[PDB]
């Protein structure tokens, strides 16, 4: 009764029958910005079902030598649907995120995926004094790939990444991971195009294995923004 789960947001719904009791990041739930924390005085637009709905990213192929995948939020969503349009037309945004990650395989497959939401995942570059540039960080909908997932591409460690909000997809056990993210920022709102509050990381800790005849095993990321607010309306940046 915690293996099955339906998530209904807006016109979108997701069912799974192999969940494993969804993660609410730091025991929190997304909310709108209350009056005693607000800064921007203009009346925000709260598009609700137009933006608070599941957006499915491009699936990535899980292969033998995969190092892992990352997507930055809100950057991965900033060109998608009415969320992307509200982001382009407003200086300020605020939202939570409902992340659902899907990966199924056979009962003869094995593999473990660490599905972790990393707040302020400031990336390091390997073997240089030069900071990562704009194109290294801002990958959009496609996301990126871990260079060194063992140190989480920032000189720390994968092994201690379970301090962050996370679930596991162990192919023997479950086929989906669900993480609910609150607004996670020092400021109550933020400019969406230059800052990423959260990084969804999906990391092959145990690689895909079978001795069946192989199939493409993809990993699919669906992300619903939650409690979207937007302030500072103007023309689109694009």
């Amino acid at each position: 009764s915690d293996r099955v789960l339906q998530l209904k947001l807006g016109n979108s719904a997701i069912v799974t029958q192999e969940a494993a009791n969804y993660c609410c990041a730091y025991g929190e739930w997304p909310n709108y910005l209350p009056d005693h924390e607000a800064v921007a005085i203009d009346k925000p637009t709260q598009p609700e079902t137009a933006t608070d709905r599941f957006y499915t990213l491009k699936s990535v192929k899980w292969e033998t030598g995969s190092t892992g995948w990352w997507w930055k939020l809100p950057d991965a969503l900033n060109n998608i649907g009415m969320f992307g349009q509200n982001v382009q037309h407003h200086y300020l945004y605020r939202s939570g995120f409902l992340i659902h990650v899907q990966c199924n395989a056979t009962k003869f497959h094995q593999g473990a995926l660490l599905v972790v939401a990393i707040p302020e995942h400031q990336r390091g570059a390997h073997n240089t004094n030069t900071s990562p540039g704009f194109d290294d960080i801002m990958k959009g909908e496609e996301g990126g790939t871990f260079n060194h997932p063992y140190v989480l591409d920032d000189g720390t460690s994968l092994a201690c990444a379970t301090i962050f909000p996370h679930q596991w997809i162990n192919l023997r056990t479950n086929n989906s991971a669900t993480i609910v993210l609150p607004w996670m920022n020092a400021a109550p709102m933020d400019f969406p195009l230059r800052h990423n509050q959260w990084t969804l990381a999906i990391i092959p800790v145990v690689p895909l294995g079978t001795r069946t005849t192989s199939s493409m095993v993809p990993i699919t990321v669906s992300i619903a923004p939650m409690c979207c607010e937007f302030n500072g309306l103007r023309h689109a940046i694009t």
Binding site: V39, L92, A187
Partner: protein, 247 residues
Amino acid sequence: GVPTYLLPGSGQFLTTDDHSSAPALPCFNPTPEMHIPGQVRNMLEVVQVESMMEINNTESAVGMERLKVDISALTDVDQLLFNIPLDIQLDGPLRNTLVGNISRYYTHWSGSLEMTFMFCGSFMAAGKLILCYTPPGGSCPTTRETAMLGTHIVWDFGLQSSVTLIIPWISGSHYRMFNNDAKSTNANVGYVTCFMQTNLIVPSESSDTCSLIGFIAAKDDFSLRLMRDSPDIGQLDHLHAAEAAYQ
């Protein structure tokens, strides 16, 4: 006696310290306070007074000419007339204002501004302008159809000679910073632009060129923070007759 120990900090002279100190003139009776008009007890009272922007900060603009914007009749629709950078920290039309000068004694600021524009053409001059505030993130709008997607006021020239464009406090952070990097996300306020909404339409006997004066003040939601030396004054030498104070 009392066992005591001195701590890090003992004997330092901190210029912002707040202590009682030895009165040099014992039993001095200061002159009794008289009511004087215009007492100021918080400097935010001063920033709420509107004062003239130097929007025409151009070469070929000399002295008081910099404090007004000339407006002419046009023969193309929807034209840009002027824009105004909202960078108080670097040098722009807001720096030598009441709000500008006092704020540059501080590093951090918050709250709404207001721009007031007085049309100083003839009684017989007519026109409508659109005054647009664009929140930051993109380039300053150069066409009227882009600018008024933002915050704006359409102004009709009439018996009331003035309008107010509120620049609402539109910011992800509680404060913005007066740092030198104007393109910083913790600094940039965005842009104010003025377009023709209709046209300046005047008599043959009125002046065909009319003048706007722009004012800026803070609102009472305005706050300033982190006091600093103002970059608006400096000396490389002693002033004249400063040596005669020693002679």
